[PDB]
Ligand binder design. Structure first.
Ligand code: GTP
Ligand code: ACP
Ligand code: GDP
Ligand code: 8WB
Ligand code: CA
Ligand code: CA
Ligand code: CA
Ligand code: MG
Ligand code: MG
Ligand code: MG
Lengths: 347, 55, 440, 424
């Protein structure tokens, strides 16, 4: 039989993957530190990639790409986009962004002065990776409050042009963001899960007051605790593609595929092709796959912007079964075979 | 991308390419002490064995 | 001209030494009886090949080599083999019984009894050198003799030849190739004791050589002979510059100057291409661009690791055969736009290139096809620390239970030497991390 | 790389004689000591076990010991009996009466210096003695009591040499007297302190294999000894023949024994057949790890392997051997300790044993061996609790306290094994 080890106990996704693997009767879970495994479901931090692929007679596979963190941290994502010629500073689907240390403190003020002098909208957002779990975010129109805020936190932050003109769902006049799940297998095929989730705001979008931040930040934890109207429009502030597509037809006479999904597929492909030579495990002595969470914003012109890339995403409750089954089919059984497709392959 | 310090002989050549620029020991006596100290520990352990066997 | 003395310790060192000197003789036109018809200076000379060979009055070319092992059966093969006439008996040194895979037995118990004899025989070779530059030392990490006696000898070489350089060729243990259970212990113990005494060390992982023999030579179960003839090709390409006319890596000092800017981080990664099966009836000869590109494939490295996730401190390319500088630069240009090659900040991004026009020599009847051009890349990359991590983990698993420790204490080693050596390795892995990785 | 072989008492000499018959046939040595083989591979390591005599005869480096003459007259009359050096038969007349005290303290002590005189003479003609192998039973008096006395005196004279024993453990299923557990418990304590490696050969296992697997309705000692001699040949293959493993008894001890007292091995052999059928490498590897092929009646599923050595003999695919060996581990990885990496070692030799195209020999250092010492311990205590049969030992000058101490020593051994069976 095939053998695997589980080293991330907090992963909702691979808890379910491991549950499915055992139920096939053809996989056995070994102890955390048994080196004789075929499959490692690895820890989030300090995954020991250097100990993979040295066990004689075992084809070994791990559920993380070494080096994919470059895409999945807020600071290094900005750096990767600016310095990669495939993406370039002239990248049209990623907001103007700068990395600030308590370095790009100077150039950020250069563009800030330019916009404010031109009387343009000058609202920015400051965020970081260390600012996890729904806090440590500042939306302001004054650069003073943004730089003063980062020095007090004391960690590497990004300042980004805040999308002042989002697409607003009706009724409710409300903000949202789109989560897409993407699976990259050991052959570096890029699979987009058919089902995405809109994570909605429950409160009407207020362009005057950025201090409240319940109608500005769409995270499921900020809407579950600080928001009135939570749940009235959609269960759990989650709209799925069928309803959203139907909305775009009724409201804006277009479809999710045409107005949004072509851009999303374009962005996913651009990001993952850019880092392919750095992280591909083709010809390597062990193989990798990884599940990614891409977060997108849509403006009122139906232009799609990339906000961030999550390297250890969770799944929406109603989508856990389908996607986890798809992970076993496409990423695990393709390497370790047992005795219609829910993914769009991005070529 | 520049080539520098090209040397040529009838057997071959050598040169350098620069793509981008940048930005106490133990004495003889001390070794002898260590080796003798280990031997003494070996002798001590063997004497304990032979003492044990004499009992 | 400045001489180099080669020292081969234990089974692995001796058997690899035999494969190297055999290949050296083929490369220099020296027959097994030591005669060299092309050397027109009879009885002497200061040619480049004289760095490795002395000369007798009868025109006999004798390796500047000492072979040391604590049991006699492997060196007895040298004494009766094809090249038995090459060496004086004074150069082949055997003890009565071996170190039983036990570092402490090779280092303390048996080593204390044979070390002065070995130094006497090396002194005899040194006394024939007008300007000895230092020593090339071949040994396994895993054997009791290769680990334990080598570290004792290196310490004494530092005392007796203080100003002389010392390079290592070290065989790193792999379960696919006849390993013993205690080899992680012996590897850590000998690396700790030898570290301060070695200026440059080329690690060869038996796992990587094994898999190259399986994949590229189509040998299902490689023997030591298959393994060692491949290793001796890599060794030959590293030492070619000491034995032939040239201007790169012309003395041992230059190895550290070109590959080792930080003294403790002195383990260059070797990568070699192409390795082609001699039984391959149809073969298309590979271009400069293709063999150079192959130098950045993990599958061709002497130690399996991923240089994309480390940083380079230095990089040397050593070509043999039909290669001209223009092809090399055109190939480097292409690779830099395709591969992840990142140097540390305080080092220039570049390559020292050496070309020798003579293509690799292949042993008649061997497994390796003759090729028109080959390259060995020596790169000091922090990625080689993956091998130290793998070894330290295995050490930690056994040492937590003190499994087998009594065998070492019973030879007079103190238990504290284990954790002292483990602590040194921990600092070593930390040094690679500070040099090679950026904060996440 | 010389080994000096010693065989003591009835069991020790009958199993020892079979061992020399088997390996003499493997090395091409006829019963008169003349070599008549066909491969020089037979002669490359002949000196490990044989001295070369004047007329190019080969003589076992073997010393034959007993306190009564009967079994050694049988050996001398036996098939290869003339091969042994006549001066190496050392024997008394009184016997030891299945009594460890007679062997260790009274009758044996009168004879032991004569044995050491012969041991000294054989060692003197060794270029570089590896060490000693002893064959004996633990349930009688001579092999058990005089055998362990011998081991103690050899250690005093050769403290840096390896001592290796093949020790037959008693079983009520194949029993001569009720005092066997006393004799075995007294001996185990000696072995814990004074051997480096001991092959535990359980007469209960031998009987079960003859009965259940070989379909012998009425096993005899001779049937039992066939299994022993095949196993002894198997575990000494790498000493006796060339191969890529360049290892002797000390290298075996270094890599098999992670803690000095835990040096009691479970041997096994495959095939065992009740035959002309081809055995495949998968079958050979499956059987060699099967409890039913083990010679110590212990269930390996009841413990964990600290270390394993596997030796394959015959012309077979080494690639297939590795695959099956990796398969066996990767399947049953809950029976190997995870804190000794690469603790299963595979070795190969081209020469198959007599009458087989291929075979495999298993050497396990498993914590399950503790079941063997528990069984002896229980049988000991059931008698010792009532001081039953003790007068046979106190009449030779022994005290009850020495029994209490041997019992505690074996219970400690059992607890040491149990401490590593849960070690994680
Ligand atoms: N590549 C290669 N590795 C070898 C060779 N011989 C042994 N090894 C490796 O070296 C290690 C074993 O050590 P040896 O060199 O044989 O031991 P030794 O130095 O002779 O020491 P003792 O025999 O213990 O006294 C194992 O990892 C072997 O795989 C060889 O010829 N080639
Ligand atoms: N540049 C921008 N312009 C407008 N709104 C933005 C923005 N960047 C972020 N937001 C809003 O802030 C929310 C939180 O931003 P961010 O993506 O940094 O949080 P996060 O890292 O917690 C996402 P996840 O929970 O998936 O990891 C987003 O969901 C979005 O609604
Ligand atoms: N396997 C085997 N066991 C034997 C043989 N002879 C005796 N035994 C066992 O050995 C023990 C008796 O010891 P024995 O050697 O006869 O007494 P000794 O002559 O005083 O050493 C009992 O456990 C017997 O079952 C034999 O030839 N083969
Ligand atoms: C003299 O014969 C042997 C000597 C050494 C070994 C041996 C055993 C086990 C090992 O790991 C548990 C090992 O690493 C090396 C050698 C060995 O096992 C193969 C031998 O044959 C049984
Ligand atoms: Ca000359
Ligand atoms: Ca020095
Ligand atoms: Ca008497
Ligand atoms: Mg995030
Ligand atoms: Mg050796
Ligand atoms: Mg009897």
């Amino acid at each position: 039989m095939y053998t695997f080890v589980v080293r991330d106990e907090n992963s909702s996704v691979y808890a379910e993957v491991s549950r499915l693997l055992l139920a096939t009767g053809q996989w056995k879970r070994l102890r955390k530190d048994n080196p004789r495994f075929n499959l490692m479901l690895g820890e989030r931090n300090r995954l020991p990639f250097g100990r993979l692929g040295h066990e004689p007679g075992l084809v070994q596979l791990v559920n993380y790409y070494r080096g994919a963190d470059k895409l999945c941290r807020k600071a290094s994502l900005v750096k990767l986009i600016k310095t990669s010629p495939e993406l370039s500073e002239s990248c049209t689907w990623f907001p103007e962004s700068y990395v600030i240390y308590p370095d790009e403190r100077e150039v950020f003020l250069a563009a800030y002065n330019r916009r404010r002098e031109g009387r343009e909208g000058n609202v920015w957002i400051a965020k970081s990776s260390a600012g996890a779990k729904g806090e440590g975010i500042l939306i302001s129109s004054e650069a003073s409050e943004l730089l003063d805020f980062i020095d007090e936190q004391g960690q590497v932050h990004v300042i980004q042009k805040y999308l002042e003109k989002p697409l607003l769902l009706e009724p409710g006049h409300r903000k949202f963001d789109i989560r897409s799940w993407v699976l990259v297998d050991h052959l570096y095929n890029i699979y987009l899960y058919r089902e995405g989730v809109l994570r909605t705001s429950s409160e009407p979008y207020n362009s005057a007051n950025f201090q409240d931040k319940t109608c500005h930040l769409t995270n499921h934890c900020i809407q579950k605790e600080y928001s009135k109207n939570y749940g009235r429009y959609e269960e759990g502030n989650e709209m799925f593609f069928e309803e959203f597509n139907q909305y775009l037809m009724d409201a804006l006479n277009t479809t999710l595929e045409n107005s949004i999904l072509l851009q999303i597929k374009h962005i996913i492909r651009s990001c993952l092709m850019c880092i392919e030579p750095a992280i591909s495990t083709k010809h390597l002595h062990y193989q990798s796959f990884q599940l990614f969470g891409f977060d997108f914003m849509v403006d009122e012109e139906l232009k799609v912007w990339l906000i961030e890339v999550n390297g250890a995403p969770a799944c929406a409750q109603k989508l856990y079964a389908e996607l986890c089954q798809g992970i076993v089919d496409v990423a695990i059984s393709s390497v370790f075979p047992l005795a219609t497709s829910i993914f769009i392959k991005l070529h | 991308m520049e080539v520098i310090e090209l040397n040529k002989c009838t057997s071959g050549q050598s040169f350098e390419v620069i793509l981008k620029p940048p930005s106490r020991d133990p004495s003889l006596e001390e070794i002898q002490k260590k080796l003798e100290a280990a031997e003494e520990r070996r002798k001590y352990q063997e004497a304990e064995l032979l003492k044990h066997l004499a009992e | 001209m400045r001489e180099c003395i080669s020292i081969h310790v234990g089974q692995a060192g001796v058997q690899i030494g035999n494969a190297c000197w055999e290949l050296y003789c083929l490369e220099h036109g020296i027959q097994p009886d030591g005669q060299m018809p092309s050397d027109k200076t009879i009885g002497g000379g200061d040619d480049s090949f004289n760095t490795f060979f002395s000369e007798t009055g009868a025109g006999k070319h004798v390796p500047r080599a000492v072979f040391v092992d604590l049991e006699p059966t492997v060196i007895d093969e040298v004494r009766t083999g094809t090249y038995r006439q090459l060496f004086h008996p004074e150069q082949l040194i055997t003890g009565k019984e071996d170190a039983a895979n036990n570092y402490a037995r090779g280092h303390y118990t048996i080593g204390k009894e044979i070390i002065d004899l070995v130094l006497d025989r090396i002194r005899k070779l040194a006394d024939q050198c007008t300007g000895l530059q230092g020593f090339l030392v071949f040994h396994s990490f895993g054997g009791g003799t290769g680990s334990g006696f080598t570290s004792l000898l290196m310490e004494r070489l530092s005392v007796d030849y203080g100003k002389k350089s010392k390079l290592e060729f070290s065989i790193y243990p792999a379960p696919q190739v006849s390993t013993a259970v205690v080899e992680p212990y012996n590897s850590i113990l000998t690396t700790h004791t030898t570290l301060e005494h070695s200026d440059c060390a080329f690690m060869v992982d038996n796992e990587a050589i094994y898999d190259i023999c399986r994949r590229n030579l189509d040998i299902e179960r490689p023997t030591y002979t298959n393994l060692n003839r491949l290793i001796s090709q890599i060794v030959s390409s590293i030492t070619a510059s000491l034995r032939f006319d040239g201007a790169l890596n012309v003395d041992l000092t230059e190895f550290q100057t070109n590959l080792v800017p930080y003294p403790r981080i002195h383990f260059p990664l070797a990568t070699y291409a192409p390795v082609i099966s001699a039984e391959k009836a149809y073969h298309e000869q590979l271009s400069v661009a293709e063999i150079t590109n192959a130098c950045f494939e993990p599958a061709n490295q002497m130690v399996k690791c991923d240089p994309r996730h480390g940083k380079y401190m230095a990089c040397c390319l050593l070509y043999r055969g039909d290669v001209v500088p223009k092809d090399v630069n055109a190939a480097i240009a292409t690779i830099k736009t395709k591969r992840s090659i990142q140097f540390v900040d305080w080092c220039p991004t570049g390559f020292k290139v050496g070309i020798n026009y003579q293509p690799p020599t292949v042993v008649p009847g061997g497994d390796l096809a003759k090729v028109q051009r080959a390259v060995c890349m020596l790169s000091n990359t922090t990625a080689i620390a993956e091998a130290w991590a793998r070894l330290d983990h295995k050490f930690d698993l056994m040492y937590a239970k003190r499994a087998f420790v009594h065998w070492y204490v019973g030879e007079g080693m103190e238990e504290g030497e284990f954790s002292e050596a483990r602590e040194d390795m921990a600092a070593l892995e930390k040094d690679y991390e500070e040099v090679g990785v950026d904060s996440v | 790389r010389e080994i000096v072989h010693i065989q003591a008492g009835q069991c020790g000499n009958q199993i020892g004689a079979k061992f020399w018959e088997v390996i003499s046939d493997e090395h091409g040595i006829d019963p008169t000591g003349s070599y008549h083989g066909d491969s020089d591979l037979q002669l490359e390591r002949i000196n490990v076990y044989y001295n070369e005599a004047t007329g190019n005869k080969y003589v076992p480096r073997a010393i034959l010991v007993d306190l009564e003459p009967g079994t050694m007259d049988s050996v001398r009359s036996g098939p290869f009996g003339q091969i042994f050096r006549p001066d190496n038969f050392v024997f008394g007349q009184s016997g030891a009466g299945n009594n460890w005290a007679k062997g260790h303290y009274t009758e044996g002590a009168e004879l032991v210096d004569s044995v050491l005189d012969v041991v000294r003479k054989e060692s003197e003609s060794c270029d570089c003695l590896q060490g000693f192998q002893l064959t004996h039973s633990l349930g009688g008096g001579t092999g058990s009591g005089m055998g362990t006395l011998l081991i103690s005196k050899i250690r005093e004279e050769y403290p840096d040499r390896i001592m290796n024993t093949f020790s037959v453990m008693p079983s009520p299923k194949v029993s001569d007297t009720v005092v066997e557990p006393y004799n075995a418990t007294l001996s185990v304590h000696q072995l814990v302190e004074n051997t480096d490696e001991t092959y535990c050969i359980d007469n209960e296992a031998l009987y079960d294999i003859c009965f259940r697997t070989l379909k012998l309705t009425t096993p005899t000692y001779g049937d039992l000894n066939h299994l022993v001699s095949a196993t002894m040949s198997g575990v000494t293959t790498c000493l006796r023949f060339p191969g890529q493993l360049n290892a002797d008894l000390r290298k075996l001890a270094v890599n098999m024994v992670p803690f000095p007292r835990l040096h009691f091995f479970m041997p096994g052999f495959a095939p065992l057949t009740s035959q002309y059928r081809a055995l495949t490498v998968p079958e050979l590897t499956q059987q060699m790890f099967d409890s039913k092929n083990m010679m110590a009646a212990c269930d390996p599923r009841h413990g964990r392997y600290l270390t394993v050595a596997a030796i394959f003999r015959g012309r077979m695919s080494m690639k297939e051997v590795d695959e099956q060996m990796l398969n066996v581990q990767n399947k049953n990885s809950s029976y190997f300790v995870e804190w000794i990496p690469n603790n299963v070692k595979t070795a190969v030799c081209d020469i198959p044993p007599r009458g087989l195209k291929m075979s495999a020999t298993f050497i396990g250092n498993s914590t399950a061996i503790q079941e063997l010492f528990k069984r002896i311990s229980e049988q000991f205590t059931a008698m010792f609790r009532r001081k039953a049969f003790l007068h046979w030992y106190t009449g030779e000058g022994m005290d009850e306290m020495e029994f209490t101490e041997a019992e505690s020593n074996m219970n400690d051994l059992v607890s040491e094994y149990q401490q590593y069976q849960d070690a994680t």
